[PDB]
Amino acid sequence: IDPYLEDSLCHICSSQPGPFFCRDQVCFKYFCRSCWHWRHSMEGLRHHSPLMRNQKNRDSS
Ligand SMILES: [Zn+2]
Ligand SMILES: [Zn+2]
Numbered sequence: 001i002d003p004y005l006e007d008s009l010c011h012i013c014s015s016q017p018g019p020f021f022c023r024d025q026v027c028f029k030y031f032c033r034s035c036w037h038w039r040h041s042m043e044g045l046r047h048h049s050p051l052m053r054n055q056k057n058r059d060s061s
Contacts (some may be wrong), residue, residue, distance in 0.1 A: 010030060010032050013029070016032030016034065018030030020033075020036055022050065023051060028045075
């Protein structure tokens with residue numbers, strides 16, 4: 001079954017669509033700029049990189 005916005009929202013702030021995701025086993029959840037900085041506030045996880053969830057169209061006509 002496909003996911004929903006009621007389960008793929010931010011899991012810490014639930015105030016944004018969770019536009020990013022963290023691939024490490026200590027995050028493994030969706031985040032926004034706010035809750036991303038809450039799981040990466042310390043220097044120990046600064047090696048993580050956010051995955052995208054949306055992109056621009058290949059046309060602008
Ligand atoms: Zn992370
Ligand atoms: Zn968030």
